[PDB]
């Protein structure tokens, strides 16, 4: 198990544009295209990301390429953030993956204002972090996935993923 399989499990794989849990146009492995409600705007974003006139459908390879880029970007957002980085560097590999997942899902901004959680993780107070992270919209909106992520942080193992 690793970050890629992990997210492949949480996000699934779809080759035609679809709406994510928030109702935003997405494609591939959780690749967000746009927050706007216009299908054509999404199609425009897609073509631009792929480099060709796609008509809203892409290939597996193409999905995989976006994915790669996206993981990469998430790590990099982490490393460039002053609040996150320190936390990240303090963690073990398995938990790092948990942190990436979250950033992938909600953005830097997103995970960066979980200050208290951050503090607790930095301290390696896992059970406590786990309760704090659950007091969130995130958890209430996507409970099965948040649970997986939180037990990851809590246990440092991949048991939630099998
Ligand atoms: Cl892109
Ligand atoms: Cl969920």
The CATH number of the domain holding residue 58 is 1.10.530.40
Catalytic annotation present for 11? yes
Which ligand neighbours the alpha carbon of 145 most closely?
A: 2
Q: What is the number of structural domains in the chain?
A: 1
* Bridge partners for 28 per DSSP: 14
Neighbours of 77 (CB within 10 A): 19
Which residue, among 135, 136, 139, has the nearest Cα to 149 in the 3D structure?
139
Catalytic annotation present for 20? yes
| Domain, as residue range, for 18 | 1-162
Return the ∠ at Cα 110 (arms to 73 and 145), rounded to 5°.
85
Which ligand neighbours the alpha carbon of 27 most closely?
A: 1
Q: What is the DSSP letter of 27?
A: E
Report resolution in angstroms. 1.9
Strand (E) or helix (H) holding 56: none
* Catalytic entry in 10, 11, 45, 62: 11
């Amino acid at each position: 198990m690793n970050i890629f399989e992990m997210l492949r499990i949480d996000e699934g794989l779809r080759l035609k544009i679809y709406k994510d849990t928030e109702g935003y146009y997405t494609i591939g492995i959780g690749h967000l295209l746009t927050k706007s409600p216009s299908l054509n705007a999404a199609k425009s974003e897609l073509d631009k990301a792929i480099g060709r006139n796609t008509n809203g459908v892409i290939t597996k390879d193409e999905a995989e390429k976006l994915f790669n880029q996206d993981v990469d970007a998430a790590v990099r957002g982490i490393l460039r953030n002053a609040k996150l980085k320190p936390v990240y560097d303090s963690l073990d590999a398995v938990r790092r993956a948990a942190g990436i997942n979250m950033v992938f899902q909600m953005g830097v901004t997103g995970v960066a204002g979980f200050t208290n959680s951050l503090r607790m993780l930095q301290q390696k107070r896992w059970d406590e972090a786990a309760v704090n992270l659950a007091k969130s919209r995130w958890y209430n909106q996507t409970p099965n996935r948040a649970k997986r992520v939180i037990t990851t942080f809590r246990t440092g193992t991949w048991d939630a993923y099998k």
